[PDB]
Amino acid sequence: EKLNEIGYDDIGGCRKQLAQIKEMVELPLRHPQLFKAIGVKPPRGILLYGPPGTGKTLVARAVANESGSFFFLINGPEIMSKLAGESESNLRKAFEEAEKNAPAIIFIDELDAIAPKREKTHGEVERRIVSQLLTLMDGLKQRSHVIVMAATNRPNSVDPALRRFGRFDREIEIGIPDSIGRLEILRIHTRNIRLAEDVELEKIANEAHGHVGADLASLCSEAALQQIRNKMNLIIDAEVLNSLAVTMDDFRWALGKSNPSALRETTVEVPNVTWDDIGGLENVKRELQELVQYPVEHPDKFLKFGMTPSKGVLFYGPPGCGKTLLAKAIANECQANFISIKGPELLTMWFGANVRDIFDKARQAAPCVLFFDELDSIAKAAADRVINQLLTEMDGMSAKKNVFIIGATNRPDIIDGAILRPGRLDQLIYIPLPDEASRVNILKANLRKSPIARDVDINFLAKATQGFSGADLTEICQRACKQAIRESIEAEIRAESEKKDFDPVPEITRRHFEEAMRFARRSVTENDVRKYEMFAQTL
Amino acid sequence: EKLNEIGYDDIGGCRKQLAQIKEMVELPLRHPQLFKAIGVKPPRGILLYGPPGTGKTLVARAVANESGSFFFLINGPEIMSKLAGESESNLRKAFEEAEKNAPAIIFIDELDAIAPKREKTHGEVERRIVSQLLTLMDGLKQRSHVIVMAATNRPNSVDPALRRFGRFDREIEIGIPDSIGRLEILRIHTRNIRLAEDVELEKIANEAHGHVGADLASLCSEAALQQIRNKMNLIIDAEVLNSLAVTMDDFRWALGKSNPSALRETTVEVPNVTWDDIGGLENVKRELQELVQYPVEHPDKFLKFGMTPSKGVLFYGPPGCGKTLLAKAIANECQANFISIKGPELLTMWFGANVRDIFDKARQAAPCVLFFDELDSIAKAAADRVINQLLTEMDGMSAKKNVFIIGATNRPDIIDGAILRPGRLDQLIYIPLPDEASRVNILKANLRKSPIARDVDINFLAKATQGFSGADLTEICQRACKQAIRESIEAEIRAESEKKNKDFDPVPEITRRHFEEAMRFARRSVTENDVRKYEMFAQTL
Ligand SMILES: Cc1cc2c(C(N)=O)cccc2n1-c1nc2c(c(NCc3ccccc3)n1)COCC2
Ligand SMILES: Cc1cc2c(C(N)=O)cccc2n1-c1nc2c(c(NCc3ccccc3)n1)COCC2
């Protein structure tokens, strides 16, 4: 009987959308007088879409329960699992009961099942039920106090006729939870499971990438199974039963063996790469501040001076110089959402229309940076369709919506000149090989989690490199760590053999870094650097 | 019960169409004696089409109510939601009840639902309804005084059989409202909502691009919701309730977060770019006047001299010289509609016939200037299909309908010579880099909204920038504005630091210094070689 007690606190990583739906639904159903007085018309149909398992199904019940409304549930499979007349009778009865017991919420859990695309019907009963649903949606009066909520995997799966301005006009996306949402879901799912004192659910939430709420429930279940195995493979005994608590190692094992279902779905989040970490690149700092931070933080100045900000940059520069991190940092300084799209991903999804989906999602998000990772794959100069999609979508993106498109290219001389036209992406910014401070910061980011020895002078390594790209520094650090692991394992084997300095190699010593450096080679030739300098004028 | 009172004043941005429909429907059904005497036959079927949310659904009721006729409504979803026999029984009862209570209007709301394309039926019950609808539409007796009206998203969706000369012969398009129509919509949706005295609804309309009437209802709803947020967050005191009025800052917030449904719908409007703003380019003014204005303003002299005007023009010149604006300006001087089509758009829509749709809309519009920007992406010399469609449409377009096709190209040498034949696009006009007079207006147009300091000599900059293209001038001003914003934001930060230690506006205008810095890095974007190449094209062809 927990259904009647499902509240907002019992739903996981949809805090922003939960607040939005609260404002949309609860307030009109709790204080109709205010909205009627001012004139606001509460929404008729709210469609929720997103990856499966997010928890969008519980949102309608939570809203109804905490607003005191009546809740009638319409399950698409249930209505489509009945005869030709009984399904229509059930739809009509649901709407009639909702009208009788207003204020009320009708929840169509699988709207895609009831009303798929008209091309997929291939029947008369299905089209009849679709038309009946349309009529009932039109039947509901503006002042009946019945709010029809719906859930679907993808909004494009619903018949377009249902998305008219009178039937389903508001669409809210319940996407993949962030780390805070993941922690909330894990806390919700562990209220009954007994947890050991050594579990840090924050770390588990931060590590689980691509995990939706159902995936986290599976994670907790598998962790409990692992604990039972550990305490049962050796051993029924009441004392042992009371000593059964999920330890952190069990959670780590479950996470390692967990195959999340939302790894392939794009993430929208505010990156935590503060510009204090990027270090130098201060010319790029100033340019990106002028191009992104000022339009978002101080719209008043732009309105005062009557300048429409340009919403398009191109990050051209040698490979492995942290263009993605620069985009993330400029997103963070503005507290702007960040969306990262790789060329292979776009081509693969096109092979499997979705160019407009990502821009629509960017519009959904608050002021955001839409970072395309390799634009030569799309703008080579099959791809002739994606290029035009992108160009037209940029040509239709109003400059006042605060969506900044930042495309990165290692090879800028191949990009089609159409993209670089004024008003599309005409803000060429050059990202050079990291300077001294940038190199120190790269080496410190690489060695953040690695215990280094005090004798190691990171500043000396940065000074010595003087030309290495970022990937080169990462390779140097990885070589040093590999040699350290090689020494640790050799010492462990020697200790085992001698059985017939508890930790002989606890930190990476200066010798490891020296040996790694001896074989280091520059990856960006001076000719390449000269070539990238001339592109600013060759265009 | 407001349905019985829906008039013409309660519908939004369809002022032109409503007047057209008023003559078509209200006048015959009000004075049948006059039309019968001369011999006019009032229309049988009027198919209203356009993007969703325009307000075409209320037109039938407004026409019926004002003319006193009987209004019987038919809903596509409703009829197709019933059994095989009841759906047909309702169609026949709708027309049977209409003839009984004539004069009357039958409004089919979703004609695409009842009568989709014959290839989409894939059933027997559905195909019986289509045929039943056809029979009823052909059973009207031209004296029954019953007028059928229909609404559809696109006319091509309807079964072609319904669009014969006896069933649905008149099609009226209710499209995206223009700025005046947006204000009509923004004033009918605000009759009940209380508004603050600081609200200038005219400004919101001119900024609401791509907003259909339904979308403008979301703006008002969102704007009022914003006011509740502001007052509720500060907070149900009755005094506060009476002080709840939508302020303009709320509207601007709503407009920023509003995602209009019709941003991708093409616009038909008369541009406001008067030729007095284009400045010079006077050798282009004479040629454009001889080809667009005189045929439209003075048809008499063309008939008197027996000359058929050439309906095609090609604009070729260096990039960023305001070719589009010149096309807009001549349209304004003729009060002609202007349709701008981009090369990328035509290919994108073709991948997703539509060439014939652009021309058909041009024909429906009053004397029109159909601009084809980037005609080098279509006439490159997939695309082979689009060029032929464009090539055939021009040939099949009678020169007497006052529709002019202007094609702008930055690279004319690539254009296929088929388009440049004497039949369709036979006139070439060269738009050069802006001259001294024009460069003054380009700078003025850019700095129209920007408060400039009196020490700035706009004339001096134009004299200095002899050779700069239009985009080069625009870049200079933006750099001036960009730098001006920087000195304003840094001054604010310095003020904050000084405030902690203890000229209201530090930089109120773009000083002469800001322009000086921008000009130093400014570089010409059209090489002297490129200018020479364009000159030789007139003879190379
Ligand atoms: C771990 C790592 C690899 C890498 C690479 C690379 N091709 O291996 C390139 C650029 C930055 C890189 N970082 C890196 N990663 C981070 C930071 C940071 N700071 C310096 C920097 C940043 C952007 C840009 C330049 C230099 N650098 C600071 O934020 C945390 C992560
Ligand atoms: C804002 C703007 C940008 C721009 C560009 C450009 N490459 O961005 C090219 C030509 C004119 C341009 N304008 C512009 N825009 C306007 C005007 C005007 N001056 C006269 C003119 C027109 C076309 C041509 C020459 C000179 N210039 C005057 O009418 C109002 C709008």
Author numbering:
A (entry chain A): 193 to 427, 434 to 550, 554 to 582, 593 to 711, 720 to 758
B (entry chain F): 193 to 427, 434 to 550, 554 to 582, 593 to 713, 720 to 758
From the paper:
As a proof-of-principle in the utility of our prioritization scheme, we conducted further studies with a schistosome protein encoding a putative valosin-containing protein/p97 (vcp/p97/cdc48) ortholog (Smp_018240). p97 is an abundant AAA-ATPase that serves a major part in the regulation of protein quality control, including mediating the degradation of ubiquitinated proteins via the endoplasmic reticulum associated degradation (ERAD) pathway. p97 is a pivotal constituent of the UPS that extracts and disassembles its substrates from various cellular compartments. To further our ability to conduct target-based drug discovery, we obtained a structure of S. mansoni p97 using cryo-EM. Cys519 is positioned within a flexible “P- loop” of the Walker A motif (GxxxGKT) in the D2 domain of p97, which appears to be broadly conserved across multicellular eukaryotes, but not certain unicellular organisms such as yeast (S. cerevisiae).
Treatment with CB-5083, an ATP-competitive inhibitor, and NMS-873, an allosteric inhibitor, led to parasite death in vitro at submicromolar concentrations. We determined that, for inhibitors related to the scaffold of CB-5083, there was some preference for the schistosome enzyme. This selectivity was minor for CB-5083 (~twofold), but more pronounced for ML240 (~fivefold). Overall, we found minor changes in the active site of schistosome p97 compared to its human homolog. The main difference being an asparagine (Asn652) in the place of an alanine (Ala655) in the human enzyme that could contribute to selectivity. We found that the binding modes and conformational changes observed in S. mansoni p97 following binding to active site inhibitors (CB-5083) and nucleotide substrates (ATPγS) were similar to the human enzyme. Interestingly, Cys519 naturally occupies an inward (in) position in its apo-form, when bound to nucleotide substrate (ATPγS), or active site inhibitors (CB-5083).
